[PDB]
Design an enzyme around this catalytic site. Structure first.
Site, PDB file in Angstrom:
ATOM      1  N   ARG A 139       0.831  -1.201   0.000  1.00  0.00           N
ATOM      2  CA  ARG A 139       0.000   0.000   0.000  1.00  0.00           C
ATOM      3  C   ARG A 139       0.869   1.255   0.000  1.00  0.00           C
ATOM      4  O   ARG A 139       1.714   1.434   0.879  1.00  0.00           O
ATOM      5  CB  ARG A 139      -0.929   0.004   1.220  1.00  0.00           C
ATOM      6  CG  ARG A 139      -2.374   0.339   0.889  1.00  0.00           C
ATOM      7  CD  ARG A 139      -3.200   0.559   2.150  1.00  0.00           C
ATOM      8  NE  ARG A 139      -4.029  -0.601   2.477  1.00  0.00           N
ATOM      9  CZ  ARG A 139      -5.071  -1.008   1.745  1.00  0.00           C
ATOM     10  NH1 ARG A 139      -5.409  -0.361   0.631  1.00  0.00           N
ATOM     11  NH2 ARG A 139      -5.775  -2.067   2.127  1.00  0.00           N
ATOM     12  N   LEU A 186      -7.637  12.013  10.069  1.00  0.00           N
ATOM     13  CA  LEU A 186      -7.449  10.636  10.526  1.00  0.00           C
ATOM     14  C   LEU A 186      -6.744  10.581  11.888  1.00  0.00           C
ATOM     15  O   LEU A 186      -6.499   9.494  12.415  1.00  0.00           O
ATOM     16  CB  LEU A 186      -6.669   9.820   9.488  1.00  0.00           C
ATOM     17  CG  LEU A 186      -5.213  10.242   9.267  1.00  0.00           C
ATOM     18  CD1 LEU A 186      -4.292   9.532  10.250  1.00  0.00           C
ATOM     19  CD2 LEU A 186      -4.794   9.952   7.831  1.00  0.00           C
ATOM     20  N   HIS A 215      -6.490   5.385  13.624  1.00  0.00           N
ATOM     21  CA  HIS A 215      -5.591   4.278  13.938  1.00  0.00           C
ATOM     22  C   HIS A 215      -4.845   4.536  15.247  1.00  0.00           C
ATOM     23  O   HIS A 215      -5.025   5.579  15.878  1.00  0.00           O
ATOM     24  CB  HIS A 215      -4.586   4.072  12.801  1.00  0.00           C
ATOM     25  CG  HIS A 215      -5.172   3.414  11.592  1.00  0.00           C
ATOM     26  ND1 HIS A 215      -5.717   2.148  11.614  1.00  0.00           N
ATOM     27  CD2 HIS A 215      -5.291   3.849  10.316  1.00  0.00           C
ATOM     28  CE1 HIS A 215      -6.142   1.832  10.404  1.00  0.00           C
ATOM     29  NE2 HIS A 215      -5.896   2.848   9.597  1.00  0.00           N
TER      30      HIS A 215
END
Length: 166
Positions: free
Chosen positions: A55, A122, A126
């Site tokens: 990724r 974000l 995470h």
């Protein structure tokens, strides 16, 4: 009053010898001892050796593989899934950070993504785990390089070996 003759240093730095380029990382042996041991163990046992980054988001971040790079065969030293190591203290904005990737409540994997660009949206999605003080440059080029029309690296990036500082 009470002096301990012996002492302990313990190298808190890790040297990831990747084919793309060598980069040093910083693990948090305070609140991250759990993930730290996993990251160090997986790299020591010889799991990361041979894997590569699948990724790669242009001008964003790049997550590295681990669980067979396809969720085929991957398991943590402690078990299959554990409790998220999220703790209000760190932040995912300063370009060059190492956050631990997760899947769901009490369900963590063995992936890792390094943010090369500021991200507040974000900032919280995470979990954290490590930092990239000396190495962000090597990751920067990985993002500036040519990518596919989704998330496929056109160039060649992979890992050849990894060892902690001594």
């Amino acid at each position: 009053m009470a002096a301990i003759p012996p002492d302990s240093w313990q190298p808190p730095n890790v040297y990831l010898e990747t084919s793309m380029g060598i980069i040093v990382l910083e693990l948090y042996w305070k609140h991250a001892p759990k993930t730290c041991k996993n990251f160090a163990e997986l790299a020591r046992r010889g799991y990361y050796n041979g894997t590569k980054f699948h990724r790669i988001i242009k001008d964003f971040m790049i997550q590295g593989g681990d669980p067979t790079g396809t969720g085929r065969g991957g398991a943590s030293i402690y078990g299959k899934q554990f409790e998220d190591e999220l703790h209000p203290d760190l932040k995912f904005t300063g370009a060059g950070i190492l956050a631990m990737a997760n899947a769901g409540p009490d369900t963590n994997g063995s992936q890792f993504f390094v943010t090369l660009a500021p991200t507040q949206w974000l900032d919280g999605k995470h979990t954290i785990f490590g930092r990239v003080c000396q190495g962000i440059g090597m990751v920067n080029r990985v993002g500036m390089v040519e990518t596919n029309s989704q998330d496929r690296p056109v160039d060649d990036v992979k890992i050849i070996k990894a060892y902690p500082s001594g």
